[PDB]
Design a protein around this ligand. Structure first.
Ligand SMILES: C=CC1=C(C)/C(=C/c2[nH]c(/C=C3N=C(/C=C4\NC(=O)C(C)=C4C=C)C(C)=C\3CCC(=O)O)c(CCC(=O)O)c2C)NC1=O
Lengths: 159, 170, 159, 170, 170, 159, 159, 170, 170, 159, 159, 170
């Protein structure tokens, strides 16, 4: 899903050519590109700091994740590496969404099957919600670029 | 996929953020956006005449298609034939707005050569039909009249590739 | 169909809330409103001239419509009044499309069942195609307002 | 219908072009567009917490709903209940982007009072749930923080009407 | 049921063989068969003009049907309206070949008054449409030109009853 | 099912008016009426003799039906009355078929559910097959009237 | 569709053998063969005169078709040849219908997709309606052979 | 196709009217019509005994079919087997009324060899079953008793071809 | 529900564990289990004769049901009638194994009075049919022959209630 | 169908693992094995006597089966051999049912298509019902082994 | 779902009477009643101790649940009362399962919608898994009564 | 088939009653029944941990499966992968209660190698996953703690064969 694929899908589901109704939708996608790309460029330049910062905020909000025995926890070097990896996956998905003007990349690569994974591996949604909140609180963006970044971050929180 | 989603999908397979150079290239696609919408709008706004004039030229060139015993003889076959020309132009037009041929490959062309071979539809004559729509579509898209003057050569080349891709596929 | 109803429909068909993917589509609808409204205002102010002008152009392109016996023809005062009425319906539908940013009004009020009507009452598509071409040639609009008006006029021609 | 389509549909029933005054009113809706998108974006971006906090407050106020024998007792019933709160907020949010309640009336509220009466779902307790989501949604939409300062009073009144419409309907 | 099957169904309910008098009446229906086929053939061969001329006369008499806001205004509504006239004539024509109204009652008219009341279709204006098709259909069926001369009065009365039955039903 | 209802059904299943294809089918129904009505009139006049004759032929072919204990048998006055009643039902259905030019009356009133009834009440198909053969052997019809009567009798035997 | 294929289809749709109901339908098809074949033989012998005569009647009823610029018109040698070809197709389809006792040949070869073709190539139904009326007015048939020919001609007019 | 439609379909592919000679041949098919209907009526009126007696003879000849482990052993398999004999005779009978084998080829025989090969149904034993139905069907159709005397040799040859076509196909 | 699930469902609505007294009552149902299975087995093993003998007695008592014009006249109606007797006995037998009538109420009897009223099936004659099956079913279930001797009076009373419930419902 | 396959089918139809609900069902299958196996062993040891005894009882109940001409009857050496074969099939199916704790073997090998076979070959259900009653009356089993054997015998009678 | 309702459902889904296949399943349900009822009686008598004991074990395994701010936690008197209530619901569902010989009561009252509830209210599956493990470790049952109780406890853990 | 039904199906193909020796072998399967139910109960009661711990070990051994570009990378692919492990264990568990692999062959494994080859799922890595579930399942089933002591070696060998059969199939 991007505004462009959605426009096509809407036309194709009715067996018809693209109309102005869909061309105007794509115009909107181009109009918001400046903000989306400002956010994508900033989040990307700051990726290392935001990822490692978020991981540390999560352990401090939930100190038990540093100490409880079990593979689901960041109480080992392996666990910590998994946690930072995961948060990096979320931040990367946010940038992909920004770049395409839609939730598609997060939907396909991350949200589909998310509930099943968290349940199976005993990962708590709250840990990732805090990481996401740290990113939101710490990206340092302003204006419509912050709106854009926060829309997708909040999309993940809702998921 | 659209062209932006393609770049993302390649990057996700490598586990990477997009580089500034790739974000620059995506920016550039946005700068070409108004031109691309003109292209889609112009082809679409003339779709009926594009299909009809190409089919007419095809049947004119290849009268055996419409003669009794011909694959486009009878109104049911002629109607199927016109619908194929429309469908192909429709999917080509989706590829142009997407800046990517995956929708045209996935939903139209994949398996079509086989389809025609099984039905006895002359794929090569289809190809001729598609190439005439190409020529008309580009002449229409690239008409210097009634639009802000600028250079659409890159786009017209790209449009070319989708029509050629279809003609090759059939 | 308007870009707004389409955005809703895309969300609702998947049982989900509106995402940025749909909000950006609606942004595009607002961005093209200036052009669409320039066209709607001009076509409306000029409605009488464009309608009666188009009707006269059709009779001159197809003089037989002024003379052939039959209720399908403008060879009576009733027939002429029907023809001018019809062309007024097309122009009015174009303005409605402009106003909503989409083909919906024309689709619902005019295009659905069009083929059946023309066939049943023996009305020739070519007569309305010429009226539409007269409007396009004579609205006097320029810039993106002409693009907008012509997109919908051409939409009707394709129909 | 959206608000623009409603004006058109009323005009088509009279056979009339829109007056300049009506085109002015439509222009004005466009000028309010960025504010309206903020409203939708803000409510949507907080939808999970809006639903969850309202349900929590409801069950806190009305403990009999969750006590054994209560309509929201058992995880299947609680899940149905949470889904109803989500569905209602979802349709209210569609009404806000549309500037028209027809989608909310047609696809959600029409027949719902009857549905609940047949199932024994306490419609009045639903209404309380919807009113708490109203209060949270408006406080969130109308938060002066993190947005360009201006007056959204007309919109917040309009948002109010959709939530109240739902609460009345149940 | 056709007229023969009706006689049988009444006899089966009494557990009886048909009497010679009833077999004589069935014989008589067979002697009227060529005339009945002419009636069906003539009405059917003119069905398009019958529907179209009746609809035209209806809209001429009742211009409010086609004026903006009218039930037959818009091409989708006009198309529905023409299709209803065609459907009714189609089922009436089945009743004529059957010599029995059960197909027309069972598959067309049953529930139609209700249908129109729910949609706001003016049933009375439909009735006028059906009565004009009646008048044209009979004038066509009973045309003394191009057929072997004889008396079809009984049949034209029977045809009348089916059209009147429809007009009453709507 | 009669040739007339079938003609209608064929038209109605395609949402179309009756064509010549169906009118010619009904013509055939009228053309065979003379033969069908000759048979119906004769079978009807001779009903009593044919029914009581067939019943007696069945008992003589299957004498055990006159002696075996059980409600399924003609070994009681009640049983005999049921058997003659049944054979009368078959003969009456044959006449109805003749009268309408089709199998409809037999199909609806007799054949639907036949297998279930015979099985449930332990009635042997062979008893009715012999009754049917007696009717065929004893109606005394000739020419196309015999063809007609025998077509329906054989239809029941096949059932 | 012929009365024979329809009879089969009616039997096959119910998974059953042909009954008398269908055999009588086929009898009707044979009974009307004399008339259908009288018409087919006459229309065929007179094909050249009827086709070229009809084409000329159409141009005289609609003189604009001889003069208006456009490939849809008989205002060129190519156009005239297309028009006479088309009318020949209609007459040939009428003979095929006669020969098989049904609308099948016209349905399959001509009527399916007719509306789409006329619309696409901007051919007016009225031109072919006049050709058909000329054939009806000029075949010179009488009795049931005229009934047969006119049934199919009128079938095409309705289409 | 029936035999008349076949002639038409060949002529339409050449773009030709039927010649007087071809109309004469079609006339001749009509003159053979009453005989053909007798053939269909006779085979159909005896269908149950034709199927049953052929199956009985088959199982008598080939006791291994019905022995434990045999393809027609068990009542479900025997029932499938009887239904196949009935289906084949049913489609053969359609071919006889049509004077053309296309219905039998299209709806019955096409793909049947493959079907049996996949299931392990012995196609050759089916062929024997079909040939015994052929012999009984012709002896019944061509019975000189109870019919107007005349020569049906051409027809009995044609009936032969349909049964042989089926036996070859399996 | 079965009888155990019913006790649970009542307890869950009060939010309570089952008392020792209720566990004792459930134990007692288990001690009656072999007797209950005999009842189900005996009724089921005789189901065909139970249905058939009751229907025979019904038609004997009420000859108008089977006379021409009667609701059970024709083999299609008689078959429907026999199937109704079988269905009712089938659901009654499920109620007996369950020790609870909910399956019989939910899947059979709910709406059946209405069904018959709409079809013109004489519900009262159905009731007579059901009562004769009751009498035969109990005489069979409670046969002292071929079983370990003991007292099944409580069960036979309970079986009674299900059949009576059905007869009342129709 | 066996209690084990039914347990699996119930789990698989819901896409779930076996629960205690199904394990307890299989426990019941093992608990009744003693009785089922007592019956299977006795019926099997006594197969020859029970089969030939039942066949003779059927001919004595229905003496016409020894004398009436026709392949459906035991009025030939072939017929008698078919009849004894058939009764052997029924007894063997009863033993198979006993062995698996369910009706599956009879259902699949015998009951499916039974009605169609009896009808087609003109075999009377009553002949097999008497054979089954002879087996029930003559197996000599007692206690729950008789209950088991009789349950399946009665199952066939109902069929 | 109980073995009895499942037996009925299996019969009803095929439109057939209960066969031995289903009666044997119900026999198994009665055979395991002794063990199931031993467990139900013991778990019930010991309910208070097991519930309050499990709740305390959960807080000691996850001490953060006693201190972290948020309504999802047992860091308030309300929270603690919710937690003990919940564990009581699980234990009560186990007894209901025992009493009916199947998972039905837990399935309907607790497992359906479980994932959605835990996710929505931010309750961690691990907290209830530990409560369940405490019950298993502390019920004090032995022999097949322990097997029964543990089967349902483990069923909940799997859920 | 279960193991009892298999013996029957082989005997029915030969037309034979089971010998006393075969009835003895079936008796022996019944004597092993409680042990077999323990095996099913133990594996099933630990199914979640069996699947999860095996998948964890697999991804630990083969980190490329979960790395970007890997077949189990992304949550949708990981979820598919976990569901495959669950499905395979589920069908293996059915085979254990049945004492026969036909359900596992028919409903799970048949065509699965092909499925994976078409999707690019690494069948060999699946096999490793299945073998680790085998090792855990047997260690759990064969745990000497909390059960009456006896020898389950034959069963553990048989369980082995089903897991190995699956691993071979993928
Ligand atoms: C449907 C539910 C159901 C279950 C779950 C069930 C289990 C069950 N397993 C049992 C025994 C047993 N279970 C085992 C199994 C083992 N012993 C071992 O040391 C090892 C490693 C194994 C591995 C499987 C053995 C050896 C016995 C005693 C022998 C026997 O009863 O066959 C028994 C007999 C009573 C007892 O000894 O406790 C039962 C009832 N029965 C049921 O009806």
């Amino acid at each position: 899903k991007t505004p462009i694929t959605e426009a096509i899908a809407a036309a194709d589901n009715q067996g018809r050519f693209l109309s102005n109704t869909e061309l105007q939708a794509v115009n909107g996608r181009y109009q918001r590109a400046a903000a989306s790309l400002e956010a994508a460029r900033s989040l990307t330049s700051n990726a290392q700091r935001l990822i490692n910062g978020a991981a540390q905020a999560v352990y401090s909000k939930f100190p038990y994740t540093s100490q409880m025995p079990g593979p689901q926890y960041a109480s080992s070097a392996v666990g910590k590496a998994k946690c930072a990896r995961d948060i990096g996956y979320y931040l990367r998905m946010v940038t992909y969404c920004l770049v395409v003007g839609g939730t598609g990349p997060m939907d396909e690569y991350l949200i589909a099957g998310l509930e099943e994974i968290n349940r199976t591996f005993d990962l708590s949604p709250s840990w990732y919600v805090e990481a996401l909140n740290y990113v939101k609180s710490n990206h340092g963006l302003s204006g419509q670029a912050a709106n854009e970044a926060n829309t997708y971050i909040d999309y993940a929180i809702n998921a | 996929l659209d062209a932006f989603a393609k770049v993302v999908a390649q990057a996700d397979a490598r586990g990477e953020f997009l580089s500034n150079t790739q974000l620059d290239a995506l920016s550039k696609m946005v700068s070409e956006g108004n031109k691309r919408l003109d292209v889609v709008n112009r082809i679409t706004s003339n779709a009926s005449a594009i299909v009809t004039n190409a089919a007419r030229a095809l049947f004119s060139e290849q009268p055996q298609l419409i003669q009794p015993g011909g694959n486009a003889y009878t109104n049911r076959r002629m109607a199927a034939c016109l619908r194929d020309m429309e469908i192909i132009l429709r999917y080509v037009s989706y590829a142009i707005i997407a800046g990517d041929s995956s929708v045209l490959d996935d939903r139209c062309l994949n398996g079509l050569r086989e389809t025609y071979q099984a039905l006895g539809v002359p794929g090569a004559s289809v190809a001729v039909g598609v190439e005439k729509m190409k020529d008309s579509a580009i002449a229409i898209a690239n008409d210097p009249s009634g639009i802000t003057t600028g250079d659409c050569s890159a786009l017209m080349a790209e449009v070319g590739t989708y029509f050629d891709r279809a003609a090759t596929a059939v």
